[PDB]
Amino acid sequence: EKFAFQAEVNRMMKLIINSLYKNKEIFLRELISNASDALDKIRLISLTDENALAGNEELTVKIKCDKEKNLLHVTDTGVGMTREELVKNLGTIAKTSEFLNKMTESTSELIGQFGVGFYSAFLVADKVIVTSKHNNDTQHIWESDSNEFSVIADPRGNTLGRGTTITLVLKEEASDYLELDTIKNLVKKYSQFINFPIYVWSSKTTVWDWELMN
Numbered sequence: 001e002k003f004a005f006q007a008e009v010n011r012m013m014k015l016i017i018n019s020l021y022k023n024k025e026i027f028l029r030e031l032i033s034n035a036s037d038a039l040d041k042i043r044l045i046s047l048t049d050e051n052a053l054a055g056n057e058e059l060t061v062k063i064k065c066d067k068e069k070n071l072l073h074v075t076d077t078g079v080g081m082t083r084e085e086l087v088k089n090l091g092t093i094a095k096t097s098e099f100l101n102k103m104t105e106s107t108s109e110l111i112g113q114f115g116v117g118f119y120s121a122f123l124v125a126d127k128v129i130v131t132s133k134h135n136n137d138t139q140h141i142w143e144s145d146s147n148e149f150s151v152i153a154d155p156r157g158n159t160l161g162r163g164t165t166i167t168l169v170l171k172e173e174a175s176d177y178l179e180l181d182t183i184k185n186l187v188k189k190y191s192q193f194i195n196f197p198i199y200v201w202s203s204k205t206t207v208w209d210w211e212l213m214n
């Protein structure tokens with residue numbers, strides 16, 4: 001159930017952490033961007049398939065601060081990932097070569113062009129948990145502290161309907177990202193060219209609910 005990252009992913013994770021240690025907020029730009037791509041990908045599957053949206057009828061992004069448990073959740077209802085997509089999409093690249101030399105040679109711009117912005121999560125996270133439910137497979141969980149990862153069947157069953165949650169066990173330097181004021185400012189900033197509604201679980205004067213940001 002446990003796996004090793006491949007060499008280039010280790011190299012790029014290190015490259016990412018030492019380039020963007022100053023612009024740490026980009027991690028949340030890249031999680032929202034990756035969520036939009038996933039929703040896009042299911043919207044197009046649904047063009048040639050009316051069962052595509054069966055698992056869950058909406059196309060959203062819901063973001064959650066849980067500051068007692070030191071966690072940040074970015075859940076989308078996009079195309080999701082089968083168990084094998086968790087293993088190769090997240091532990092592999094292949095589909096790079098010169099990128100490792102063209103990134104060493106502003107790389108904040110260029111991380112998103114190769115779609116590799118997921119690893120920017122380790123800038124702020126000690127653990128990343130990816131819970132994903134794909135129409136062609138059961139819900140699975142991917143877990144890593146960057147020194148390895150594992151995928152396991154989710155014992156809670158299919159909670160997502162379809163889609164993906166990124167869960168970040170935040171570092172102590174990233175405790176700032178647990179206050180709604182900061183989070184909603186960074187989400188508002190990075191959600192404007194996103195074609196899906198993006199919500200944060202927020203507080204109003206007191207009850208909790210999804211608050212729309214775009």
Ligand SMILES: COC(=O)c1c(O)cc(O)c(Cl)c1CCc1ccccc1Cc1ccccc1
Binds near residue numbers: 032078090115
């Ligand atoms: C299917 O995507 C997710 O579930 C997902 C997601 O829904 C949110 C995320 O933050 C991330 Cl990181 C993923 C993983 C996706 C991924 C990460 C690294 C390399 C490849 C891919 C595949 C891909 C292809 C087209 C459009 C979106 C995603």
